Structure 1
Amino acid sequence: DNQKALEEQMNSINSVNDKLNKGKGKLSLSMNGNQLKATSSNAGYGISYEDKNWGIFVNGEKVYTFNEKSTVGNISNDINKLNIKGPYIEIKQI
């Protein structure tokens, strides 16, 4: 909408944080220059226990795709091993 040209890591990610921090497994979004580090609380346990098709998109391109019954900690920190420069990343299932 607007953050596109500016920072990008704004409310677009925090709206994600509120959605992912829903009780069970939860992915937190944070960026440091060339480094996406998403931390998973709930001891790595998953969001859900059912098959949902998940995904992350950086500026219209696919970053990572996963399932809610997976260990959000093995999911998230894999994404972070990559240490991605991803500024505008949409973390939401499809």
Structure 2
Amino acid sequence: DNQKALEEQMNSINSVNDKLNKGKGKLSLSMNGNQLKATSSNAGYGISYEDKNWGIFVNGEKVYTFNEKSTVGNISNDINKLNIKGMYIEIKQI
């Protein structure tokens, strides 16, 4: 019944999922349309990756902010709790 996740999920959430992670620590994310889910270790976390910034935007609005040192692994954890969404973009009205 909750399978509706896929629909809300867009191949884009894939490249990204793998993007936000290219050598940090031991972290494995999962792709759920409106949710992210991962687990990780903070041993070799974002090493080569000094203190760099990331910014996520939903409906064209922030939705979560983390640094590369903050080792998202730790973060993305809490984050997922905001059960992101799939496809929403927009315009602001006065």
Q: Into which bin does the TM-score normalised by the smaller protein fall? A: 0.5 to 0.7
Q: Which stretch of structure 1 is more off in the superposition, 1-10 or 29-38?
A: 1-10
Q: How many residues align?
A: 94
RMSD of Structure 2 on Structure 1 (CA)? 7.2
Scaled by the length of structure 1, what TM-score is found? 0.58
As a proportion of its length, which structure holds more strand? Answer: 2
Structure 2 unaligned runs (5+)? none
Contact 1:47 1:69 in 2 (8 A): yes
Structure 1 unaligned runs (5+)? none
Scaled by the length of structure 2, what TM-score is found? 0.58
Sequence identity percentage = 99
Higher relative contact order (CA 8 A, sep 6+): 1
As a proportion of its length, which structure holds more helix? Answer: 2
Bigger Rg, structure 1 or 2: 2
Cα distance change, pair 53–19 in 1 and its aligned pair in 2 (3 A): same
What do the CA deviations read for 1:7-60 (whole angstroms, capped 9, x no partner)? Answer: 452221111133234222376554546543244467682364422121111121
